[PDB]
Amino acid sequence: RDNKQAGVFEPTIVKVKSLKFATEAAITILRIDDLIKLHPE
Amino acid sequence: GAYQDRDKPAQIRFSNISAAKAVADAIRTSLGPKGMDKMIQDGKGDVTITNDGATILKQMQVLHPAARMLVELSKAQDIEAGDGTTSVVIIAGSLLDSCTKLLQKGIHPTIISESFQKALEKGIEILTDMSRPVELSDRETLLNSATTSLNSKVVSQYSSLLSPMSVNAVMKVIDPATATSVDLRDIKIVKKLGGTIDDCELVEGLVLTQKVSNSGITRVEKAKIGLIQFCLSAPKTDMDNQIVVSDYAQMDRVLREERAYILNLVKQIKKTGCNVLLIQKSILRDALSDLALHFLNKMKIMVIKDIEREDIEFICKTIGTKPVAHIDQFTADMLGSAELAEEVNLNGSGKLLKITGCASPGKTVTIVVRGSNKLVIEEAERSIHDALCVIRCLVKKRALIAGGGAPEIELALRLTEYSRTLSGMESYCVRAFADAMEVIPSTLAENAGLNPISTVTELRNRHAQGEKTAGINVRKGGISNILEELVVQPLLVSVSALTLATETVRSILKIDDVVNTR
């Protein structure tokens, strides 16, 4: 439809910060290549 | 000829070598423009991401002793350089790999070290030859140095913004003249959860993680700052004291007089004309009184309690305002002044104190970190911190070298012929010694996923007349003029790395046995 006509609207910054924040996390998680575990003492 | 009875040492040696090689090869993945950060989960349960090997190793709970020294080795390199902690260990292990090579080659370890002692002397000589002297004032080369360090960790995301932040900060805290070894602790780091790494900030002023104590005073203009040490509460002696009540008028007289004492206290403070209050911890005894805050807020004065004794020098280094521990000494002569100071509001409600602009410019400075991942913030500053370190390292010596492995292949090449020159079994050691340096460029093409042997030999083949300026390019994925790629590192970096490794492996060779203890 036209959500513009339907009034289905969302605040810009929602998507704004979202795409940023996902970008960082994806940046974080992708860079990993190896995990090392430690059993507790 | 002489006969060797025992083999317990030799095998014990081999054990260490196998350990070391395993260790370095494990770290080998993370290095250079194509370095790959790693992650550890603590047995206590903590989780860490890291691209710098030293922090990896300080995270490493190594059982075998030898690499623990290698772990220790990097910390000195970290206490020296900051990156190449990455590079240095892979150098270290690679040496032992060839040191292994010579072991079944039967050569007694002692001569190896002296051969290595000779081997290092050539290299440090060579590296001096190839380096590029550069005065400190050239901002861009510092910047060129900067991103060269920076395009090794994740902070490469906002490198182009991060690098200037770093160098400018150094310029503001250093003296561009004495060419001394200015401390970094005069730079403050602010780990503020949330925000964006892009939103990480520099503060030409002062920022305190703590929060205000006034409800109503939020922003202050032309602030006159005061830092006070002596508590503002009911006067309590160091020694035992007590008010005795036996009579009638004791009550209110006591009652009234404490406020009066408090009143004059604040009265003098206002009399001084200060408007922003700094209060340290007084955990031994009473702090600021609630009542005084009532007055100070009645006197409409900005106030902060709970200031760490450790930071106080930095702050007065920052604000240029000597503190006060007695009323008479508290005087506008010492009253610091700031153009503006207030508490910012981020994190939705993660609120933070800011002090911008000081009539007395302290050399010190603080640094703001924003960004989503908590761990990524910590890794970022690590990258930021080392970014500072290499600059300071560069501050130590006004000489510059291209990064990207070109010095190493030059060296091994240069070692290759000089080894040919030198006769005796030492040549092989140096022959091996140079072959150790061969690893790092190979590692690059590995992390570049390019044919290392074809490339690095071609890198040698070019470098036979393709001297230190040229080398393997990451961005184009070939071999090019790294200087023209503006990928440059200070001389001492590899110097320290080369030097530090040399002494250690010598110490490595002298080992013959480990005895389990009580």
UniProtKB/Swiss-Prot annotation, chain A:
<comment type="subunit">
    <text>Component of the chaperonin-containing T-complex (TRiC), a hexadecamer composed of two identical back-to-back stacked rings enclosing a protein folding chamber. Each ring is made up of eight different subunits: TCP1/CCT1, CCT2, CCT3, CCT4, CCT5, CCT6A/CCT6, CCT7, CCT8. Interacts with PACRG. Interacts with GBA1. Interacts with DLEC1.</text>
</comment>
<comment type="similarity">
    <text>Belongs to the TCP-1 chaperonin family.</text>
</comment>
<protein>
    <recommendedName>
        <fullName>T-complex protein 1 subunit alpha</fullName>
    </recommendedName>
</protein>
<feature type="binding site">
    <location>
        <position position="10"/>
    </location>
    <ligand>
        <name>ADP</name>
    </ligand>
</feature>
<comment type="function">
    <text>Component of the chaperonin-containing T-complex (TRiC), a molecular chaperone complex that assists the folding of actin, tubulin and other proteins upon ATP hydrolysis. The TRiC complex mediates the folding of WRAP53/TCAB1, thereby regulating telomere maintenance. As part of the TRiC complex may play a role in the assembly of BBSome, a complex involved in ciliogenesis regulating transports vesicles to the cilia.</text>
</comment>
Swiss-Prot record, chain B:
<keyword id="KW-0067">ATP-binding</keyword>
<dbReference type="GO" id="GO:0070062">
    <property type="term" value="C:extracellular exosome"/>
</dbReference>
<dbReference type="InterPro" id="IPR027409">
    <property type="entry name" value="GroEL-like_apical_dom_sf"/>
</dbReference>
<keyword id="KW-0378">Hydrolase</keyword>
<feature type="binding site">
    <location>
        <position position="489"/>
    </location>
    <ligand>
        <name>ADP</name>
    </ligand>
</feature>
<comment type="subunit">
    <text>Component of the chaperonin-containing T-complex (TRiC), a hexadecamer composed of two identical back-to-back stacked rings enclosing a protein folding chamber. Each ring is made up of eight different subunits: TCP1/CCT1, CCT2, CCT3, CCT4, CCT5, CCT6A/CCT6, CCT7, CCT8. Interacts with PACRG. Interacts with DNAAF4. Interacts with DLEC1.</text>
</comment>
<dbReference type="InterPro" id="IPR002194">
    <property type="entry name" value="Chaperonin_TCP-1_CS"/>
</dbReference>
<feature type="binding site">
    <location>
        <position position="404"/>
    </location>
    <ligand>
        <name>ADP</name>
    </ligand>
</feature>
<keyword id="KW-0488">Methylation</keyword>
<dbReference type="GO" id="GO:0003723">
    <property type="term" value="F:RNA binding"/>
</dbReference>
<dbReference type="InterPro" id="IPR054827">
    <property type="entry name" value="thermosome_alpha"/>
</dbReference>
<dbReference type="GO" id="GO:0005654">
    <property type="term" value="C:nucleoplasm"/>
</dbReference>
<feature type="modified residue" description="N6-acetyllysine">
    <location>
        <position position="267"/>
    </location>
</feature>
<dbReference type="GO" id="GO:0005829">
    <property type="term" value="C:cytosol"/>
</dbReference>
<dbReference type="InterPro" id="IPR002423">
    <property type="entry name" value="Cpn60/GroEL/TCP-1"/>
</dbReference>
<keyword id="KW-0206">Cytoskeleton</keyword>
<dbReference type="GO" id="GO:0044297">
    <property type="term" value="C:cell body"/>
</dbReference>
<dbReference type="GO" id="GO:0042995">
    <property type="term" value="C:cell projection"/>
</dbReference>
<feature type="binding site">
    <location>
        <position position="32"/>
    </location>
    <ligand>
        <name>ATP</name>
    </ligand>
</feature>
<dbReference type="InterPro" id="IPR017998">
    <property type="entry name" value="Chaperone_TCP-1"/>
</dbReference>
<dbReference type="InterPro" id="IPR012717">
    <property type="entry name" value="Chap_CCT_delta"/>
</dbReference>
<dbReference type="GO" id="GO:0005874">
    <property type="term" value="C:microtubule"/>
</dbReference>
